[PDB]
Symmetry: T
Subunit: 135 residues, 12 copies
Amino acid sequence: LIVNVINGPSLGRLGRGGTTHDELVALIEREAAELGLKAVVRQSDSEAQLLDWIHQAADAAEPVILNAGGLTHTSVALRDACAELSAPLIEVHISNVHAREEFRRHSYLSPIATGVIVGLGIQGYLLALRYLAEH
Amino acid sequence: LIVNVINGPSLGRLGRGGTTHDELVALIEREAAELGLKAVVRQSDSEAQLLDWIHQAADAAEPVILNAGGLTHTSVALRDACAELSAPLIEVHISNVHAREEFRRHSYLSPIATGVIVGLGIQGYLLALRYLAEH
Amino acid sequence: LIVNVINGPSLGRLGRGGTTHDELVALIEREAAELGLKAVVRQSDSEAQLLDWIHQAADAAEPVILNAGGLTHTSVALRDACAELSAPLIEVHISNVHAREEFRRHSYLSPIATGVIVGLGIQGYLLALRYLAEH
Amino acid sequence: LIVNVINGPSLGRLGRGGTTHDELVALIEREAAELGLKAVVRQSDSEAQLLDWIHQAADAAEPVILNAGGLTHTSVALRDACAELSAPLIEVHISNVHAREEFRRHSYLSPIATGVIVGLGIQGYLLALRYLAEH
Amino acid sequence: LIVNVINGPSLGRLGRGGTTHDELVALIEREAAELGLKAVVRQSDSEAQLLDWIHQAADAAEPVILNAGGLTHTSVALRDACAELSAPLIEVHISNVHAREEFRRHSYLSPIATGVIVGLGIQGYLLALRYLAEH
Amino acid sequence: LIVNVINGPSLGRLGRGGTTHDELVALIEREAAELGLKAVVRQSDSEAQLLDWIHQAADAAEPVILNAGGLTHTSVALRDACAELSAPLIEVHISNVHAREEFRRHSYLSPIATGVIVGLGIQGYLLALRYLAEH
Amino acid sequence: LIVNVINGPSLGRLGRGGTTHDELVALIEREAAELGLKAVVRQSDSEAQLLDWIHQAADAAEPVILNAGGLTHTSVALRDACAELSAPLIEVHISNVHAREEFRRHSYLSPIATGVIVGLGIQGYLLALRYLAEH
Amino acid sequence: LIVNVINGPSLGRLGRGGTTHDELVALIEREAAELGLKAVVRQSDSEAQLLDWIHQAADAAEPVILNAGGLTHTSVALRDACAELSAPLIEVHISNVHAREEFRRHSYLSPIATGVIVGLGIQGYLLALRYLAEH
Amino acid sequence: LIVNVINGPSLGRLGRGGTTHDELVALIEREAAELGLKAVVRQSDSEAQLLDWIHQAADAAEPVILNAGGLTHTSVALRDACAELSAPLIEVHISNVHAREEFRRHSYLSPIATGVIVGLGIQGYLLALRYLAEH
Amino acid sequence: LIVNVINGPSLGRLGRGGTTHDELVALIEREAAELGLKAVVRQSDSEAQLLDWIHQAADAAEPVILNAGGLTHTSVALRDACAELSAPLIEVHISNVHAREEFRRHSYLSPIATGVIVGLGIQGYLLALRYLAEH
Amino acid sequence: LIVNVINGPSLGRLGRGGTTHDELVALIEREAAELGLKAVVRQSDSEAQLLDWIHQAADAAEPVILNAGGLTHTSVALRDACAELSAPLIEVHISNVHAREEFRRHSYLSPIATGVIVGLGIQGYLLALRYLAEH
Amino acid sequence: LIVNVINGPSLGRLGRGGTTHDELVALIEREAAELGLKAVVRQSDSEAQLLDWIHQAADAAEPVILNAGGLTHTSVALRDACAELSAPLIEVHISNVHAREEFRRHSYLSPIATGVIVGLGIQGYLLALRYLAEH
């Protein structure tokens, strides 16, 4: 029923691609409604903030769609917290990371994720919702 | 309107996971119909067969959903043929490759793909369709 | 006399292994009393919070027992702050990191630590206390 | 006219080298005045705090002199935020990093910086100002 | 009840740090007595001698505290013999190996050990005893 | 009082960026005058020529600003000669090397330099002068 | 009872070592008869052909002796198909690969094989038969 | 007298650079005539097809000009078959591979080739002919 | 006529897999008799002991079947002594090493061996005998 | 019309292969005449000499055929000077470098060259001429 | 006055190069006499034996000429024991190791040796003596 | 009879260790006289100068003692010229390179040298002479 969408740094800057973070929340909320889900979308540049939201979803046994931004490639902490999730974890990148710098082609999160969606824009979020609806 | 779904080796063996390759074709065909698309699904263990289907989609300017199996990690040829596509290319893995052997965590295809979906089972195919419908 | 015990992310989640973080504080406090020490145990998922506690121990010339969780493998910042400590620094892992992923077998902290204890469970904390008592 | 000087962890500890962080602010402020600039100097051990100050400078199209401390070698997030700056970005290290550990000889920031100054002490800040004044 | 302490090459040279190998045996024996344990301490520069003592402890299901010296970094054989132990294995280094040459930062033994203590001097032996007493 | 500016290959080709090597000499000479310094600027495509100028500055105990061009990444000889300097050595790159090929991101000179300035154009030379004036 | 012997490229060229591929089939057939086995020996330069023969042996639960030639070092596909076999898989090289180029010292097949025989000439095939007879 | 020109995948797509594969055959045939040679030009996306043509040239002791496309970087099989050629083998790339992705800068074929021509366009084929004519 | 079977550490522990080292000697002795061979089987955890047995076989020009255990991956000495053998050397592993840790996938012995048998259990010894009988 | 042929160290030693450097000049001069070109062939063991000849060809917008000998693998300087050429640059090796030491399989020049010819002997020079004539 | 010459495995096999180990002892003894030295030459295939002889020379403050054979590349233990020597340590290889396998081009002993002599045959021993005589 | 001693950069700076380059020439000349040799000692910071002296010794079939300084680690050219020598080549380092930076532990010259002497000071030159006298 409930799905957590968690955005790391600096996804607050979407727009500043026309879509803003707020537009994104709204798109996600609408699609969620359509799927009979409730989406809790949250963004933070703070690793610790993210860890806290992840722990919460671990305790509630809620699924997570997670776009960690740059922490994806760097944070073992975040990985460890996600590793505790018992519901599904979908990792999401808007851009195709494999078309950029080699360092972006590694993720500490993918191996503990259920699955990963990259390069499909903001629609990756919606497709992740839909996966979770049909599961 | 038309979408090519291309499966490499040995996706003919799905089932032998309950879903068979034929079931998969049927699921994909149904979803495609629902999206107002036509899906041409094709499978082959032959790299050359795949290259030929890719060239065709290049000439027709049709989008491709491609699950190359093991050739994903090994074939520059396949990459080169896909690199010619002008419509979108979605790379698909049923399993989460990042949860397996390190060698599976590299793909010659991802960097030239539009995007990539891994670990969402056979539903990755359907989600890829839906991306292409809304684009 | 005073010993700082510093726990990083997500050691707040011990339990959720039966021992909780609170139990851990209590075990450490009891052992410290027994050794004629005072233990100040502190936990945070915030790197910056940890850095601040480390700086404080640097200024006070107090010893530190530090379990950085995942930041152990990733944070040069933390290393740099610890590098300032003039009293002893004992690094502690509950689990044996060398029995897990290769990435966990490197630590930015070990080379500037006095010593390191891994894989002895929560008792590593108590043994670290005892080292510091007899020194 | 306005120049942002951003210091990461643990540059609050300069002194504790005689020069303190406050002295540094004052030196920078004086030189800035001399150049007909205004310097906004800010320090934080929080990656997120830094990201926020960087985003701000991105939105204001102000130049940044940035000394990220240890995050220089570890944070893709920070890199990504700096990558958004449209004014110049000068990276600054007080010490010569190339004379220390090999891990310090890589920086996620240098490739997106305008330029880099290392090993010239606190005077690197002043020289960076002067670059920006004559540009 | 019985604990095997096994020292490899060239721990016979402790002293030649004031503490000699004999002093070490005596310190260990005293602490063991205090814990209600019996310590069998043995040293050899011969890999084969060590393997034999390890096999013996495997057959007797006795715990081992093992300081292999340089064989720690080089001997798969020793690892394989330890891998047979069913009681606990604590690996011990007197010096902090992570503060020395990079080659010393790898150990064939750590991954099959219960845990590891480095850089706490000869007291690591005593702390290892105490772990085994409370277990 | 005296400062040696040493340019390697092929900095004779500056211009052929509008600034020519001669303009550069003149800019440097003017700034030097302004600082109460004398600048001896010299350029050569010959490694041996450069080594000779470096040895001379070693014997005279004069500071060197050195832009070695491509020899920066390749010449241990040059490093060894600079290693003899007892006055300061500032390494200078006009372009930001960290924004180019990976091979340019290593320098045999940086670790023995006092400091390094890259990506600030020809102004890096002038800023290096100014460092040396205030020191 | 039935054993599949599968030869990849270009084992059709044995002879062109006196033994030809046909001689090899005959030697294998004779030894098989002697062991109370039936040997189905098949050769192809086509990866896809091989995959098909492997799938067949997977479905029939027949053991495979496989000499993949150069695909041994390059084909994840082949590995994946073999990974499906439930009967034994013996990998065979006629030549000692470890005495040749470093690239030949890796095999995608060995880790999923039951065992491997290299450098014993064509007799490796016969010894593999005999293993399978006594099992 | 006879020269084999062998083109791998997907050199059938030349044109789709104006020159088509057919034009290429014709250019090669004309130049061959001019040199007093006969050129047999053949193309295939099938590795196995190529291997067969290579074996044939091995048996006939005919020289080969070979442009393997992407198999150049990936196929040990192809290398092994070429290694059997007793006449000359010239490797040909139309594009300069060293100006592209790092993975293209390795070739399994070069070390067993007589020589290699890259980046000279379709004229590399003609120059290879001419080498073989004057030899 | 005579064949040396040499077992390193800790193959004395076979059993402690039901087959003991003694059973193994007996199996080998019986098969040898059957082949018209005499088998001298010897085991030692001492590298030096093994070297001595290898030198002896070098001087006698007798073939060796050698299972070095862990020294296989670590000992250049052993390699060097085997390199002197003029009769055949068969390397034997009971387990499939390629299915274990990456470090076990390298052997200092394979490149100087005649051939290698891994993963066929104790029957690898018997098959090695049979190779040597038919040679 | 004019083509520069530049030979590095120690191509003065051709002969001391029967062909001497002088013969080579003469062969090149004759072929050039035949093509309606003028060839300026020059050789030097001095990197700086070569750089000077390269700069000259840059200023004159003349094409270069360059055989740098060992500097090919080592000199970034030379690369940088060639990178300035606006006419074509053909890199030439007489021997097949890919059949020798691994270090020779890298070239700082290839990526900035138009194309590369290796292993065709002195005829590579003549073929390079011919390329440049038909272009 | 006294010099220890220590030979590891399998230098007992010199001859079996005409010179035998005994001849070598005699050559060394004669040269030593000539230099006014006494040479104690000792050989063993046992690492532990060597360690014991090294410890002895450490305690006696005698210089060591050491040819460790294959242990040179593999033994940290031996390195550690040599690291204790306070008199000079000369490392000796008869053969030029840098002309053989890459693995032989690393030595755990060289960095703690006074110096190293390779590839001069048995005369390296005599030259090492002479160094020690004139020192 | 004649021996060439060749010193690269910056061995002209010996002294500026008390021994100067001139002293070194004199020591070498005296020892040479004593051995019934003539020593031609030559020094240059110019790679090309060295190459010329090496070519000369190649043509004269004279032995070379060569201390290339930093070019030892960097110059393939120099290696190639030495590779032509038919008399012996002894490589000499005054300092123990294996006790310094890792980059100094590789030499392009060692593998083509007869032998190598490092860390014995200027006496390495004299010992190299003596080797060549007794050969």
